Amino acid sequence: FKLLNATKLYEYCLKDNRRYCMFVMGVGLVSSWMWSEWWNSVWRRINKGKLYNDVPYVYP
Amino acid sequence: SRAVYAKLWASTAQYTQRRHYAWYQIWSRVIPWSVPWGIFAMWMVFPAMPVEYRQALTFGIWQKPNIGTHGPDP
Ligand SMILES: CCCCCCCCCCCCCCCCCC(=O)OC[C@H](COP(=O)([O-])OCC(O)COP(=O)([O-])OC[C@@H](COC(=O)CCCCCCCCCCCCCCCCC)OC(=O)CCCCCCCCCCCCCCCCC)OC(=O)CCCCCCCCCCCCCCCCC
Ligand SMILES: CCCCCCCCCCCCCCCCCC(=O)OC[C@H](COP(=O)([O-])OCC[N+](C)(C)C)OC(=O)CCCCCCCCCCCCCCCCC
């Protein structure tokens, strides 16, 4: 709690509700995309050699 | 005295100017709400734009998701 209070996130971004909303919207925007790309990478990591890209078709 | 009554009468002559000042104050308090809602507008309308414009507006950070399909054909 001392660490968090030292970052002064409350003073600058959460004590005023207009800024609270700005924070919510922007953090949403960025976090969603990071989460998405991370799950993409996991989905490619677990399924290696099973997906379409990993095993090209070779013509006869 | 005429002088004092004149001053008291004149105290409110500039009603319209004070009302313009009030307009200014309330709009200054209100207008920052445009930023949250602006971000959300852009959030919703970003995937409607051309792929090139998505790449440009994010300074090249955004790229087509990689889900392991529709790769090149030799
Ligand atoms: C970690 C520890 C844990 C902590 C825990 C703490 C607790 C909190 C949790 C935190 C942990 C993480 C949690 C994960 C959260 C995130 C995941 C998440 O939320 O996903 C949700 C997830 C959403 O997934 P998705 O939507 O598929 O995600 C796709 C992505 O969003 C992909 O979509 P996209 O890519 O299409 O997105 C587009 C995006 C794309 O985003 C990007 O690409 C942005 C890139 C971001 C980069 C990041 C930067 C920051 C990092 C930098 C590093 C700094 C370095 C310094 C520091 C280090 C070094 C010192 O772009 C935008 O948004 C628009 C751009 C910006 C707009 C603003 C305009 C700016 C203009 C720019 C001007 C400048 C000039 C430009 C012009 C060019 C010329 C000059 O949920 C779902 O999938 C849905 C669930 C189903 C539920 C439905 C809901 C209910 C509905 C029912 C309602 C019906 C009932 C009635 C009503 C009921 C009412 C009650
Ligand atoms: C006050 C605001 C009220 C907002 C109410 C609006 C709610 C209904 C929104 C419908 C949007 C439909 C857009 C038409 C274009 C086709 C969409 C589509 O599916 O395209 C294919 C695309 C995908 O394309 P594709 O892969 O199918 O192929 C076509 C490729 N492009 C798009 C490049 C041509 O699908 C989407 O991305 C879904 C559309 C998301 C857009 C959502 C827009 C929301 C609008 C709200 C903004 C409000 C801001 C405030 C404004 C107030 C001003 C006074």
Q: Which two tokens stand for residue A52?
A: 């379409």
CB A18 within 8 A of CB B33: yes
Tell me which residues of chain A have a C-beta less than 8 Å from any C-beta of chain B: 18, 21-22, 24-26, 28-29, 33, 36-37, 40, 43-44, 47, 51-54, 56, 58-59
Q: CA-to-CA distance for B17 and B11, rounded, in angstroms?
A: 13
Which residues of chain A have a CB within 8 Å of the CB of B40?
A: 25
From which experimental method does this structure derive? cryo-EM
Phi first, then psi, for residue B18 (nearest 5°) are: -60, -35
- Mind telling me how many Å the CA of A14 is from chain B's nearest CA? 14
Q: Which two tokens stand for residue B23?
A: 């307009």
Task: Locate the DSSP E strands across chain A.
Answer: none
Nearest to B66 by CA among A52, A34, A40: A40
Q: Which two tokens stand for residue B72?
A: 């090149």
CB contact under 8 A, B36 and A25: yes
